[PDB]
Point group: C6
């Protein structure tokens, strides 16, 4: 039961989060009109969303942890992209007459981008340790019962 809920929380969370961001990016992209990177970041980011969306289409009809990875990865990947795209936008909006102000965007981006990925590693690190922590405590308890059994 806990398995389905985990996925469902992932199902709707991704769809709504992904669709609104892609639409906002598309609307802002047509308004203003590094140079080449802009076209790629936008198109690719959208795809990350599309797949997660379909995941929602196929999940209900139907290993559980495997598909789980697809969502956490795709969704988390996008977050980096959204902030990634905005950094470029400032470069696009200012890059013309405002280049001076534009630099502050990409430069300030590095401090936050690192913390975001770095924090993800720390949270994940503590988690793995627990997987091993439970494995040790679990076998120890089984020996206590097996020893008194004799």
């Amino acid at each position: 039961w806990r398995k389905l809920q985990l996925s469902r929380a992932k199902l709707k969370a991704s769809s709504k989060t992904s669709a609104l961001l892609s639409g906002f990016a598309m609307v802002a992209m047509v308004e203003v009109q590094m140079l080449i990177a802009f076209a790629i970041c936008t198109t690719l980011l959208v795809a990350v969303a599309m797949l997660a969306l379909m995941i929602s289409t196929c999940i209900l009809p139907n290993l559980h942890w495997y598909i789980e990875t697809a969502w956490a990865f795709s969704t988390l990947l996008g977050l980096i992209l959204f902030l990634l795209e905005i950094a470029i936008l400032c470069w696009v909006k200012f890059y013309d007459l405002s280049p001076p102000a534009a630099w502050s965007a990409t430069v300030v981006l590095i401090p936050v981008m690192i913390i975001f990925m770095a924090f993800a590693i720390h949270f994940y690190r503590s988690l793995v340790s627990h997987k091993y922590e439970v494995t040790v405590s679990g076998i120890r308890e089984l020996e206590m019962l097996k020893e008194q059994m004799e």
Copy 2:
């Protein structure tokens, strides 16, 4: 009971997903203003949505698997279109002064587009294997009872 839920999940999911994307595409289309393809992709994509919408209008009043196909097909079909349309937009925004950057959009599109359709086949393949697999598991037991029966 499970039959109605499957459709309902399809009923609302399609409507909301379809209406927002079509509106965003229409808004961005009027802002910027391959050449001919742009007009077609937009208009057609909308239709895919419209039908699915009506499906919601007729389903509640009222074979179940048949209609089911219409939704999975129409919805999945649209996803390819949305990402399909954005690729063209970059070409519409850059195609003028930025043609160089525009190419990265359609090119990068191929890698993701293939994986999307390809993954769909794999998921479907595993599903079919089970449908038949079960058919074998069910009858097998029946023969067991039959032999012991007599």
Copy 3:
């Protein structure tokens, strides 16, 4: 009980579907600025929605099948209009510098428009047949009881 639910499903479904589409059409209409038809399609489409909206206002306070027709008709009518309006938009956005690409919009429109209305007839046809089908099967059963009754 089933009667109220059928209407309620119609009550909210129409309001949300109608209001968002009219607003999107109004926003895109002011951005770009067959010629005369454009003004009519937009204004009329909105009205179809407005009435359905009020239907929601008057229904709760308060023959059931009669009002039911108004919703199914108005809502379905709009779907044709939305796709109808977009076809014109392509003709409006392109009609200036892109007239060549514009034709593909209206032409491609015919294939989908027909299928939409045509499919509606088929679904409705099967429904009517069943209504009669049940009417015959029902009376036949009552005669079986009435005959053995003697």
Copy 4:
């Protein structure tokens, strides 16, 4: 109990319906920039909404039918205004280069506007008749109990 629900359905329905329409009208108004009427219709329509909004703020804390009238009136009044404003918009967006097409907007407006108000009268008429229809049937039943009482 039925009394509170009727109002609540009115409470949220008005707020959401009113706020989104006013914002859309304000956004489109600044984009394009009968002549004088435009400014009035927009500002006034908003007010109709604002009051209804506050009605929601004061209702929860705290004759019931009296306040009820304020909502039905304000909300219904707005619907006429929204379609009213769009008619003017076409006159504003086309009034420049497209004056010819503009006329089709106001003219086509008359057919729907009449039906909207006319239909409201019919629905209300049937309602009043029932109120009296029940008053007659009710007293009749009481006399049946009073007569057999003797």
Copy 5:
């Protein structure tokens, strides 16, 4: 229990109502570009919302009537501002070439603005009377029990 609900109804109601209006005002403000007043009204109105938002952040963690005042005041205060800002917008959109039409906006504003604040006083007035009305009826009943007690 009734205390928490009253606040919660206030918690979400304010956040959604405030955030959407501020964003719409900001979007329309950048599109057009009394003169000085415009900048102030917009910035200040936003603040009124921000505080109410935080109120939602601090309320859940944790006198009840005191905080209650902050919401009713801030929210109601904003309503006047929104209609206030729109009156200025008409003056901003028309103030250039359309000054004549602009006047109708601010002038027509006075009639509705007064009724809004005036009606608020009346509703509040009747409320204060009841508070006292209950205080009198309550003590009277307690004496009835205390008298027969002897």
Copy 6:
């Protein structure tokens, strides 16, 4: 149980509040096009949101008070930023031809900004006192039981 709810209320509240504000800021930023500060405020504000978003991604899978701080801090921090950004916008829209009207924005900003942060301290101050207030009342009750125990 109360622990999970507190976080959940924080989970969705932050995501919706953060995503809409960042999109509105991005849309308005591209429309108009202190000078350098504008680029930074926008980019940084977004980051504050992104992290909070991920917090929602990692919380469900899995000390409680620690993570709690991250949300209250990030969310509250943003509020100051949103109003902060708008102050700059007025300076961006007016800063060109309207510099005079622009000053009223930043100046008026100080009065509200202080109250916002100042009020936060007061609410927090009363809270801390209670933490100590309970600590004293609690130990006192335990002694009452321990004393009569002898």
